[PDB]
Enzyme design. Structure first.
Site, short mmCIF file in Angstrom:
data_model
loop_
_atom_site.label_atom_id
_atom_site.label_comp_id
_atom_site.label_asym_id
_atom_site.label_seq_id
_atom_site.Cartn_x
_atom_site.Cartn_y
_atom_site.Cartn_z
N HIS A 192 51.44 50.55 28.25
CA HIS A 192 51.87 49.56 28.99
C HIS A 192 52.65 49.07 30.24
O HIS A 192 53.53 50.12 30.53
CB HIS A 192 52.95 48.12 27.95
CG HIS A 192 51.70 48.27 26.49
ND1 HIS A 192 51.00 46.77 26.79
CD2 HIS A 192 51.98 48.19 25.16
CE1 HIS A 192 50.41 46.76 25.18
NE2 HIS A 192 50.93 47.37 24.27
N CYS B 185 50.01 46.71 33.19
CA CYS B 185 50.34 45.33 33.85
C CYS B 185 51.11 45.52 34.85
O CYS B 185 52.14 46.81 34.30
CB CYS B 185 50.40 44.85 32.87
SG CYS B 185 49.13 43.94 31.61
C1 LIG Z 1 49.70 44.27 30.32
C2 LIG Z 1 49.29 45.41 29.94
O1 LIG Z 1 50.42 46.30 29.73
C3 LIG Z 1 48.14 45.87 28.96
C4 LIG Z 1 47.83 46.79 30.03
C5 LIG Z 1 47.06 48.06 29.03
O2 LIG Z 1 47.51 47.81 27.85
O3 LIG Z 1 45.93 48.97 29.69
N1 LIG Z 1 47.14 44.60 28.92
C6 LIG Z 1 47.06 44.19 27.35
O4 LIG Z 1 48.28 44.68 26.49
C7 LIG Z 1 46.67 43.30 27.41
C8 LIG Z 1 45.02 43.19 27.48
C9 LIG Z 1 44.64 42.94 26.59
C10 LIG Z 1 43.76 41.37 26.45
C11 LIG Z 1 42.10 41.79 24.78
N2 LIG Z 1 40.77 42.22 25.49
C12 LIG Z 1 40.22 41.12 26.40
O5 LIG Z 1 40.77 39.89 26.28
C13 LIG Z 1 38.80 41.55 27.02
C14 LIG Z 1 37.93 40.82 25.99
C15 LIG Z 1 36.40 41.12 26.85
C16 LIG Z 1 36.51 41.99 26.97
N3 LIG Z 1 35.28 42.25 28.00
C17 LIG Z 1 34.85 43.62 29.14
C18 LIG Z 1 33.68 43.63 29.41
N4 LIG Z 1 33.41 44.88 30.31
C19 LIG Z 1 34.37 46.09 30.39
C20 LIG Z 1 33.62 47.16 30.22
C21 LIG Z 1 34.50 48.38 30.88
C22 LIG Z 1 35.68 48.18 29.76
C23 LIG Z 1 36.40 47.06 29.39
C24 LIG Z 1 35.36 45.63 29.46
N5 LIG Z 1 35.75 44.77 28.89
C25 LIG Z 1 37.43 42.97 27.67
C26 LIG Z 1 38.89 42.78 27.29
C27 LIG Z 1 46.53 42.06 28.27
C28 LIG Z 1 47.94 41.03 28.34
C29 LIG Z 1 48.25 39.91 28.65
C30 LIG Z 1 46.76 39.61 29.80
S1 LIG Z 1 45.86 40.94 29.71
#
Ligand SMILES: *CC(=O)[C@H](CC(=O)O)NC(=O)[C@H](CCCCNC(=O)c1ccc(Nc2cnc3ccccc3n2)cc1)c1cccs1
Ligand SMILES: *CC(=O)[C@H](CC(=O)O)NC(=O)[C@H](CCCCNC(=O)c1ccc(Nc2cnc3ccccc3n2)cc1)c1cccs1
Lengths: 88, 173, 88, 173
Positions: B113, B161
């Site tokens: 994170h 992020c």
């Molecule tokens: C904000 C952070 O610090 C953190 C960074 C980290 O953990 O690396 N991000 C978050 O905690 C968080 C991310 C989770 C969001 C949920 N995921 C999705 O909604 C989602 C939906 C669809 C896909 N599709 C996809 C397609 N192709 C891919 C190819 C390779 C890898 C992955 C693929 N995924 C992915 C994710 C967040 C918090 C706020 C915003 S993001």
């Protein structure tokens, strides 16, 4: 004798997004930036220097979807091209 | 074939390697002999946190990056679920590794994170921040604190992020 | 209809030194980084993209003298190569 | 010859321009037609200061950069001896220029005294800091605050110190 050297040189950082902004991750597929970086490295390490590869990764994110992010190259002091020469 | 040490990484042929060495002059980083070089890489990945959500899927990133850096010829150290203080201590230990002397480059991978200020340690919360700054990673790996990697490419990769914003603006077409 | 665009994209910054560090200037000759940048742009704009030119400027500073500085490329979100195509 | 509009800048021939357009695919920034494009560039240079030493030689930099950017086809605005607030106001005005719509790129040049935090305005002192951050320059020129330069290369050049340190360490050969 002693000689002077640059305190900071030959660095490159590659971040998953621009400052202020989120980076995306899938529960089973992993982090898109990481997955994209591996794929590009596998494909282009043989022919492109790491800076060129990082630009290519950036380009793959150019068209924004529902999960837009723009990986950013940071604090670059590479004075030369860094080729991985995979297999060597 | 993917059965070799380089796995899925496409190989650079002897002709391609000479073409690159010809197209660009003395503007490429020197590569050490494969038989004697001791390339090192470090992955720090935080998945389990005290106060912030679990980074489900991090294992896929760990696997992917570890195999990739090994394919590229690096010995990969993987450290997990560290505080910023632990990350600092691990980074200093990495900078002190004797193998850098007989290496031509390094890779550093950070996955966690993150906020605007930097990368989150395992204990991070708004009340008590546990952050490692990018500036600190550079400082720990520069010529002063890591003389063994003088003149050698140091590649830092950060998956995190850098704030709460979606990174988008609207425009009409 | 409306479409999403990356808030930050197609940027490149080029600084005269690394963070924490001084940049040099002569009372009659000007700033070395500026003079060096112009010379490289004049020479290489025809053949190299701006990122490659910036690396070349960096390379010219590689050997440290009494006034060492290492120009740094910062916060890069160029998705493509930027060629100036001088004369066009 | 240096008598032309491009001056001392070496020209790209039609063969070289096609070679570049062939060696790289759809991975080059599009250039607008020379007859209709309105390229803009901005130079902010601080030489005279209230409390910090005069930047003797800045005129050479102003001349050099102005002529260079003109040679590359940009209309150059030169602003001198501004506070950080003045720099901000000038940057916002620059971001609002209609010519960016019919431009394919821009150059921003900043020349002043600097500290770790950023670039010094004319009124800067330790007691009362007058600093413009690099982050602010980016923000003012991004897609939100400068939609006209969406998808277009924005090159920022900063001549300034970033601290007091000499940038060197010793090693024995
Ligand atoms: C904000 C952070 O610090 C953190 C960074 C980290 O953990 O690396 N991000 C978050 O905690 C968080 C991310 C989770 C969001 C949920 N995921 C999705 O909604 C989602 C939906 C669809 C896909 N599709 C996809 C397609 N192709 C891919 C190819 C390779 C890898 C992955 C693929 N995924 C992915 C994710 C967040 C918090 C706020 C915003 S993001
Ligand atoms: C720290 C700052 O913010 C500021 C940045 C700026 O003004 O752009 N720098 C300083 O105020 C200051 C620089 C003045 C140092 C005096 N100059 C010299 O000692 C010196 C000596 C010799 C040369 N030679 C040289 C050779 N080739 C050149 C080619 C092109 C241009 C110039 C060339 N000059 C140059 C300068 C500093 C304060 C602390 C450290 S630097």
């Amino acid at each position: 004798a002693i000689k002077k050297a640059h305190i900071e040189k030959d660095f490159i950082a590659f971040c998953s997004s621009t400052p202020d902004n989120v980076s995306w991750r899938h529960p089973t597929m992993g982090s898109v930036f990481i997955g994209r970086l591996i794929e590009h490295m596998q494909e282009y390490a043989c022919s492109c220097d790491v800076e060129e590869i990082f630009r290519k990764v950036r380009f793959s994110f150019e068209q924004p979807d529902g999960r837009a992010q723009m990986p950013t190259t940071e604090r670059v002091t590479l004075t030369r091209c860094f080729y991985l020469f995979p297999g060597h | 074939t993917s059965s070799g040490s380089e796995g899925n990484v496409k190989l650079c042929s002897l002709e391609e390697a000479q073409r690159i060495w010809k197209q660009k002059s003395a503007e490429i980083y020197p590569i050490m002999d494969k038989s004697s070089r001791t390339r090192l890489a470090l992955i720090i990945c935080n998945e389990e946190f005290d106060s912030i959500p679990r980074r489900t899927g991090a294992e896929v990133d760990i696997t992917g990056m570890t195999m990739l850096l090994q394919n590229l010829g690096y010995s990969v150290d993987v450290k997990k679920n560290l505080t910023a203080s632990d990350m600092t201590t691990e980074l200093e230990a990495f900078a002190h590794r004797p193998e850098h002397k007989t290496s031509d480059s390094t890779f550093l991978v950070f996955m966690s994170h993150g906020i605007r200020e930097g990368i989150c340690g395992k204990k991070h919360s708004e009340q008590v921040p546990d952050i490692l700054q990018l500036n600190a990673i550079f400082n720990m790996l520069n010529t002063k604190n890591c003389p063994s990697l003088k003149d050698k490419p140091k590649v830092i990769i950060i998956q995190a992020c850098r704030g709460d914003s979606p990174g988008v603006v609207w425009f009409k077409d």
